[PDB]
Design a protein around this ligand. Sequence first.
Ligand SMILES: COC(=O)NC1(C(=O)N[C@@H](Cc2ccccc2)C[C@H](O)[C@H](Cc2ccccc2)NC(=O)O[C@H]2CO[C@H]3OCC[C@H]32)CCCC1
Lengths: 99, 99
Amino acid sequence: PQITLWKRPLVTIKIGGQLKEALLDTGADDTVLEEMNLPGRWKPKMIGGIGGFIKVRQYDQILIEICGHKAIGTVLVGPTPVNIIGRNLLTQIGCTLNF
Amino acid sequence: PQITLWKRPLVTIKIGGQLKEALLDTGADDTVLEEMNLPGRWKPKMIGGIGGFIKVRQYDQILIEICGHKAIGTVLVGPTPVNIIGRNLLTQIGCTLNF
Ligand SMILES: COC(=O)NC1(C(=O)N[C@@H](Cc2ccccc2)C[C@H](O)[C@H](Cc2ccccc2)NC(=O)O[C@H]2CO[C@H]3OCC[C@H]32)CCCC1
């Protein structure tokens, strides 16, 4: 589909057997989701935003379905105010900016 | 144009007569540029993102050209790590997400 930017581009995602709302974020290198208890191994990581850095848990080869489009990649989990779908997954669903 | 997301969606912008590189950021409500001198009155403001808040100078009704498209809107200037073009200006140039 096509998504205008009058409002935040929020969509439904499916991850780890749960439905959530997440922000399609072309300004994000990585995908960062709100605290959730995903199974399997993880590694500590630090990611920076405009205000500084936060600690997150890095999970690899995680499946996320974004508006019916599936993507598999690295997902970071930590105290973020919003679920962020970043370019590592947006590329996999064929997402482009157009003007 | 149509822009894919394998690399950061950086474009050249012209503001205050000066050229800069900026990130087309669908995950940003607002446009925030690195420290620079701009003509016109400004008001102090604060914006929050991942990591916390930064103090910015808010310029209203600023002319800015983004990849050959003109916009006139609010520009925040402060210690942001990267120049980000947010939805307030992305809407003006007709930018949409598509997949
Ligand atoms: C490689 O570094 C990243 O990519 N790290 C992330 C990031 O924070 N990237 C930011 C750019 C950027 C690039 C390098 C270093 C610092 C910053 C841009 C993101 O879209 C961010 C997402 C977001 C949305 C709502 C609330 C909070 C965070 N939006 C944002 O901060 O927007 C601002 C301006 O407008 C306002 O509305 C939203 C908030 C305000 C993306 C993944 C994790 C962090």
